[PDB]
Design a protein around this nucleic acid. Structure first.
Lengths: 391, 850, 393
DNA sequence: GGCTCCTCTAGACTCGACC
DNA sequence: GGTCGAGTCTAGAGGAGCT
């Protein structure tokens, strides 16, 4: 199974009881190993480039994991309590019954709480990032961060864009993001029909949409777009309205808030399921691009070639797996099966012939063909292949 | 306890027995200076079971030692002198050693040798030619023949000149030995290398001044170049080298295409070396008749330096520290240039006290709304292409601009020169050509000398403008206020800077010279005194320059040293079993390309190893000697001769005045705590100056015949220095004799001017220390005996100590901390502090014998 | 003008004037980085990642939660996670009492999870995980950039870039000195004044050797990175003494690797490089500056110029160069003001496209370092920008 | 009292580039 | 076939290194 397969190749992490459908979706454990982080690091970059770099009037936001906290009910965010203060009450003076009741109330009245979504992080930065565009609309605020949802406490890395758009054409902009997000998720997908959009409505009646992924157990909302309007923005900014109004083309209009929210921890599971003895991750998402090894002796001579070759690829931004450093040996086929399930794009072998004319063996993950290529032409081919796949 | 009439302590009875009216005059001179009386406490008596001295007296003993040590090699040299062989033979392009008749390795015991090396490969030998009786020999490297894509960048005995009681001769045999495969092994294969250059320097050596004039005595001497030596000793047709210089300036392909010519240009040199040696050998055996001289020279020709994997680490760390410390200095200068380009705007450069006199001219670049809503899906592709095509259309205007790209017209002229061209392969952003030595850097840094801005005159060098594009005299006055009335170096009014008096900066060599760069370390004391106060770094620039000055000059030598790493199979069993051994490391050696002679004083010279490059706390790469670390199982026993030349001069003075130790005031002060000059002048001004111990004659370039009362200083210096070289010869001969007779596993490591180091196993180390002490004692006894003195003082009988240390360093207690080695040798490498043992401790540990 | 005020105006900092104090910036109890400061840190975190995880061998990423399991140790001061519903359920659904409520408070300190204080304990939980990855081949390491919570009470958050190095005890004194040298070079690589980064040896409460990097902030030196020779006790604490799972291959034999912790402060790192780099210009390193190109338009025709700039914008963005689209600004800005605006924002180059560009294709190209305007053809603009940035690395 | 090597700078010749 | 603004090479001078 993929859950076990990603465990062997260090895409997954945790005990056998933690590699379960309910536990993986929970986020109560570190579900990614050394390789899974880098693949999830690629989704963070691909999301960032296509939603911030190439997009007009989108800016970066970083927000605290904790929130100020409130005494209102119906919220289940886990609070943060100082153990020293807890030990202070129990050990110092033996407070009365009334004090203990007050202490537990104080743990909800003033104690901070962990964040559940990144929307409130952007809203406190709306005023300062409004100044960034000289109060022009539309614009957005994007962020990737870990959010906590109760279950214990689960950790979910959400990629959220808060798009501020005028009240007019808010539905059109929501369809604009709905199409781009559906195209962005389907851009890397080997099965783009697994990503779906469905119309959904908020409890307050506000319009919205969801993006699912057809996991083998069912479709899970990897991404959800809500047309929040201005109620959420006015909640964080009550009273004066001048500081909230953006300068539209004809009048000052409070921008309706579009909440484009997506989960990269859950997204990475989608692209792990989508790729699956070879994980055919998209060339922009595979965490390991090049696998370098030494074919035979002389080990000292070949390892210098690989180390020189490795230093060239690393300086070019291409991630490499220095497999030549291992003292153990296995058959070439065992290396091929090992690398495929590791989603290694290309496997490079430095043999004696590399010392004679510079020709090396270049195996492609997608086609299983070995191409004989000169050492100097290796880096040119790798950059060309990655550049074409990005576009 | 034995005392001379002058109360000087001498050898004890036990040592004296085994080894071996003018008093009133001596006291009168002694009391006149004020050294009469004042006795000293007697040192503890030393007794040893010295081996029976051969031939009776010490002189005959050392003569017998030399005649038993160098006997086979004299015959080996004589074999060439009467050898017969066919003339210079076609060149062979094959691999390995080829025998040019009328074998895997040359078999004969005599070989005139020369090696040619392509500098493109750096250090690996390219080809070599060997002269041997009855057959020539030629060598071709496997890198020259096969032409593979890449080779091993680390050297080893595998890719070296192979071989296998034998004498090898050449013009710079060092080079020949440094490329021989078997000379890097810790096991000492019995081969000795004899140099024609060293024998030339011994016979007709030209001094430092004489070679300058040579490049009378001119007809009897010549320079060390092979052509000059061949013209001197043999003459005939002159030698010619190929003007192409393929080995030095040409690539490997050119050497491949001209192999049949390089194999002739090398064979010619080998034959010339043989012809020179034919006349050098009898002439040198005549000039220096004492066999100890030749034996000591052959022992100086086998210097061997072991290293380990730390050598590559040393090179990498030193180079990276040099770069980073240079990058910090370079990047600090570049920012000063960038911050000055802003003075162009508003014509403010004319008010800068330092950058007014620069090129600020500029060239010219001459040739030949409401929200629309979300863009629709079709607008996405439409907008993309129309913007993309609006650029690809402009790509056709490439031919509307000049072919040669005009270089930074916007940047001022002085900044353009500091910025490399865009097409330069070494182009770096900003003023990448800045350096402290440039004439703009003292102007960029806004340097001040005692409150005055600096300025450069094309004749007088760097100076400062004392107030009194037009120079901003107002700015000069303004700076002085912020910081006739000056009387430094003479004000040169020929410069004629308006409103200023140009006073030159002081120089170390006097006012007759000019200052070329105010960043010279000579001005470092002036920097701290507050006179030469820099502006926008500062002293840190001078500190960086001081720290990297050694490595800047010496990195192309140290990094280029030919290190051959021994494989595990070639290491001795001792190293493969010592607890300090590690399989993940590699161990090797450096063969110092030491010329046995090289001066008129017959001193051995080498730019890297035979220079006193002791570790410094403020120098990058100065731990060079500390990187000579014995492999596990071995140690470096050594000693420093206490006042070698000083005691030689004293004993020469003592042997002349009253014929006893301490009779001279100089000798009295030397032994404890102008007669020497008279004897030195008598020896130098004689018909043929000779060493007062081994009778080695002076070079034919300094005999009074050719030079009629000329170069007196060189001769008088030569007397003492050649006596020191004789002392070294005696020490090396006696050490080799004691090593071979008593079967001590060791070999000669290296001998700097005044040190003697030996690579010996820790097992037999105290035995080696006792051997060294005995050799010292015997050498001192012979030196006293040959001068007409029948006794030797106790105070100089034995060394102060004999060092036993894991690495090469001046003292065993030094950790060798440098900017590139801040943790020292104890922390970074685990080398413990060595042992220093006096004579008594060595006696106790060795029980008085071996 | 002060640096904090400058960075607040140019969106390197974010926060109220009360949150921009010296102590408040050190604590981390508030998101202190604006849209540009996040990009400066995102560059700094990428520079650390390339130097320590990409270029270095035997270094891997690690995923560690923000929550550590509850420890009953009284010396612990980490904040605990408490369910708000659990507090309400006990307190409101029944009558409380002095006897019964203490059972709930005692259970909090005993079982409830806690916010992590360092990335070390996350690496130790993944130590065994990497032993399979590297086939036990000592030495190796795990590196991570994440948020660590430390009490101030208030919960301060600072982004720590940790490297937990597992080496045998013989080379522990060597790798501790190796990383201390390797770290001090990386911090000094981007600094305008490398002398401000210093190292001083320190000893902890157990006498173990250590080394702490500093940056000479204007108020005083701050320990942005501390290195420790922790030893075996941290591994002996997390793992119940079963030596089989702790020993790795240190050559021929097997030895329990000595733990070395290098713990840089990324959030304090950007603060140093903002102080290090500071006419008013943030002379940030080209590999650290958030904005590198600043496009623009001329007098007119603006419609034709914007077609060129939009095509130019996609040319640079597809080539990995951050661009500031200054041609979309709705208020006309003079050159003198536009230049100082780009300088304070640490913009490397101020590209300007005018009507002349439509015929010959030459665009002006100003430099932050030199403030000198040089013209260049559009076709060669990308080549120079890539070359300048590649040579700055 | 001597050199020698590295680095920076000025001047004269060459070139090909444009016209 | 003409001027002329970059390459290029040689020559000169000064600092650091050894006696």
């Amino acid at each position: 199974a993929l859950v076990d397969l990603c465990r062997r190749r260090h895409f997954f992490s945790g005990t056998p009881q933690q590699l379960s459908t309910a536990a993986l979706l929970s986020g109560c454990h570190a579900r990614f190993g050394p390789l899974g982080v880098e693949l999830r690091k690629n989704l963070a970059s691909q999301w960032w480039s296509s939603m911030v770099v190439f997009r007009e009037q989108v800016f970066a936001v970083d927000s605290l994991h904790q929130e100020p906290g409130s005494s209102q009910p119906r919220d289940s965010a886990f609070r943060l309590v100082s153990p020293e203060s807890i030990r202070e009450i129990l050990q110092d003076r033996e407070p009365s019954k009334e004090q203990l009741v007050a202490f537990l109330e104080n743990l909800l009245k003033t104690s901070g709480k962990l964040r559940a979504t990144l929307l409130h992080g952007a809203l406190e930065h709306y005023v300062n990032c409004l100044d960034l565009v000289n109060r022009k609309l539309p614009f957005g605020l994007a962020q990737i961060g870990v959010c906590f949802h109760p279950v214990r406490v689960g950790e979910k890395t959400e990629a959220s864009l808060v798009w501020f758009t005028p009240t007019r054409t808010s539905s059109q902009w929501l369809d604009f993001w709905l199409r781009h997000r559906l195209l962005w998720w389907r851009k890397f997908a080997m099965s783009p029909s697994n990503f779906s959009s469905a119309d959904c409505q908020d409890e307050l009646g506000r319009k919205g949409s969801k993006l699912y992924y057809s996991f083998p157990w069912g479709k899970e909302p990897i991404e959800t777009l809500w047309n929040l309007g201005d109620q959420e923005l006015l909640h964080t900014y009550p009273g004066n309205v001048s500081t909230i109004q953006g300068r539209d083309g004809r009048k000052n209009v409070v921008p309706c808030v579009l909440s484009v929210s997506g989960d990269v921890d859950l997204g990475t599971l989608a692209y792990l399921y989508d790729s699956f003895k070879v994980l055919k991750l998209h060339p922009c998402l595979a965490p390991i691009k090049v696998a370098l090894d030494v074919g035979k002796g002389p080990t000292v001579e070949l390892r210098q070639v690989c180390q020189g070759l490795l230093n060239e690829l690393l300086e070019n931004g291409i991630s490499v797996w220095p497999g030549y450093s291992e003292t153990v040996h296995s058959s070439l086929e065992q290396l091929h099966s090992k690398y495929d399930e590791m989603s290694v794009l290309f496997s490079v072998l430095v043999t004696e012939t590399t010392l004679e004319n510079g020709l090396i063996q270049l195996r492609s993950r997608d086609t299983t063909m070995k191409e004989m290529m000169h050492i100097s032409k290796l880096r040119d081919f790798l950059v060309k292949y990655l550049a074409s796949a990005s576009n | 306890l034995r005392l001379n009439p002058l109360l000087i302590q001498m050898l004890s009875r036990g040592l004296h027995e085994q080894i071996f009216a003018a008093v009133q005059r001596s006291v009168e001179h002694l009391q006149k200076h004020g050294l009469w009386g004042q006795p000293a406490t007697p040192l503890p008596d030393v007794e040893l079971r010295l081996p029976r001295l051969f031939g009776g007296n010490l002189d005959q003993h050392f003569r017998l030692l030399a005649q038993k040590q160098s006997l086979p090699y004299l015959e080996a040299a004589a074999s060439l002198l009467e050898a017969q062989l066919p003339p210079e033979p076609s060149w062979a392009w094959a691999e390995g050693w080829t025998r040019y008749g009328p074998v895997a390795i040359p078999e004969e015991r005599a070989l005139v040798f020369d090696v040619e090396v392509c500098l493109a490969e750096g250090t690996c030998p390219t080809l070599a030619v060997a002269i041997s009786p009855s057959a020539w020999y030629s060598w071709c490297s496997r890198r020259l023949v096969e032409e593979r894509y890449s080779w091993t960048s680390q050297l080893s005995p595998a890719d070296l000149i192979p071989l296998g009681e034998q004498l090898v001769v050449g013009h710079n045999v060092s080079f020949d030995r440094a490329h021989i495969r078997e000379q890097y092994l810790i096991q000492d294969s019995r081969m000795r290398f004899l140099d024609t250059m060293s024998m030339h320097m011994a016979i007709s050596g030209l001094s430092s001044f004489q070679r300058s004039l040579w490049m009378d005595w001119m007809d009897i001497s010549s320079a060390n170049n092979l052509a000059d030596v061949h013209n001197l000793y043999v003459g005939g047709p002159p030698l010619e080298k190929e003007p192409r210089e393929l080995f030095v300036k040409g690539s490997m392909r050119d050497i491949r295409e001209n192999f049949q010519d390089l194999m002739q240009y090398c064979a010619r040199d080998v034959w010339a070396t043989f012809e020179v040696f034919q006349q050098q050998l009898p002439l040198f055996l005549e000039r220096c008749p004492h066999p100890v001289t030749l034996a000591g020279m052959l022992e100086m020709g086998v210097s061997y330096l072991p290293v380990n994997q730390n050598w590559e680490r040393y090179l990498t760390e030193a180079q990276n520290t040099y770069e980073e410390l240079q990058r910090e200095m370079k990047k600090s200068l570049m920012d000063l240039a960038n911050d000055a380009c802003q003075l162009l705007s508003g014509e403010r450069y004319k008010e800068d006290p330092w950058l007014w006199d620069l090129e600020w001219d500029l060239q010219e670049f001459k040739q030949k709304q409401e929200d629309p809503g979300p863009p629709s899906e079709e607008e996405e592709l439409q907008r993309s292409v129309t913007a993309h095509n609006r650029l690809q259309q402009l790509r056709s205007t490439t031919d509307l601009l000049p072919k040669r790209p005009q270089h930074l017209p916007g940047h001022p002229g002085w900044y353009r020169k500091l910025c490399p061209r865009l097409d330069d392969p070494a182009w770096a952003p900003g003023p990448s050509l800045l350096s402290l030595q440039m004439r703009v850097t003292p102007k960029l840094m806004a340097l001040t000398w005692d409150g005055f801005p600096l300025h450069y005159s094309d004749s007088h060098g760097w100076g400062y403008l004392v107030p009194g594009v037009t120079c901003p005299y107002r700015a000069i006055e303004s700076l002085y206020r912020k910081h006739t009335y000056h009387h430094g170096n003479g004000p040169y009014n020929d410069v004629n800077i308006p409103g200023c008096w140009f006073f030159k900066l002081p120089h170390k060599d006097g006012n007759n010279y000019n200052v070329g760069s105010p960043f010279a370390k000579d001005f470092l004391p002036k920097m701290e005194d507050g006179t030469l106060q820099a502006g926008p770094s500062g002293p840190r620039a001078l500190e960086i320059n001081k720290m990297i000055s050694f490595w800047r000059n010496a990195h192309k030598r140290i990094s280029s040293q030919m290190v051959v790493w021994l494989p595990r199979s070639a290491l001795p069993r001792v190293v493969t079993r010592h607890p300090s051994f590690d399989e993940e490391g590699h161990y090797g050696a450096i063969l110092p390309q030491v010329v046995t002679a090289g001066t008129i004083t017959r001193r051995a010279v080498e730019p890297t190893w035979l220079t006193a490059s002791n570790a410094r706390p403020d120098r990058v790469g100065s731990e060079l000697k500390a990187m000579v670390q014995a492999p596990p199982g071995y140690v470096l026993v050594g000693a420093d001769v206490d006042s070698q030349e000083l005691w030689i001069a004293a004993v020469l003075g003592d042997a002349h005045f009253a014929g006893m130790h301490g009779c001279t005031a100089f000798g009295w002060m030397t032994l404890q705590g102008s007669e020497m000059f008279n004897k030195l002048e008598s020896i130098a001004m004689s018909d043929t100056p000779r060493t007062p111990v081994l009778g080695c004659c002076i070079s034919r370039a300094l005999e009074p015949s050719v030079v009629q009362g000329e170069f007196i200083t060189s001769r008088v210096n030569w007397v003492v220095q050649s006596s020191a070289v004789d002392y070294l010869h005696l020490m090396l001969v006696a050490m080799k004799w004691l090593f071979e007779e008593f079967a001590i596993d060791g070999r000669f490591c290296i001998s700097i001017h005044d040190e003697v180091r030996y690579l010996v196993r820790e097992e037999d180390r105290y035995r080696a220390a006792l051997a060294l002490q005995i050799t010292n004692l015997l050498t001192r006894c012979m030196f006293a005996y040959k001068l007409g003195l029948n006794d030797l003082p106790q105070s100089v009988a034995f060394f102060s100590a004999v060092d036993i240390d894991q690495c090469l360093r001046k003292e065993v207690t030094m950790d060798c901390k440098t900017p590139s080695n801040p943790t020292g040798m104890e922390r970074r490498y685990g080398i413990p502090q060595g042992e220093a043992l006096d004579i008594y401790q060595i006696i106790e540990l060795t029980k008085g014998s071996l």
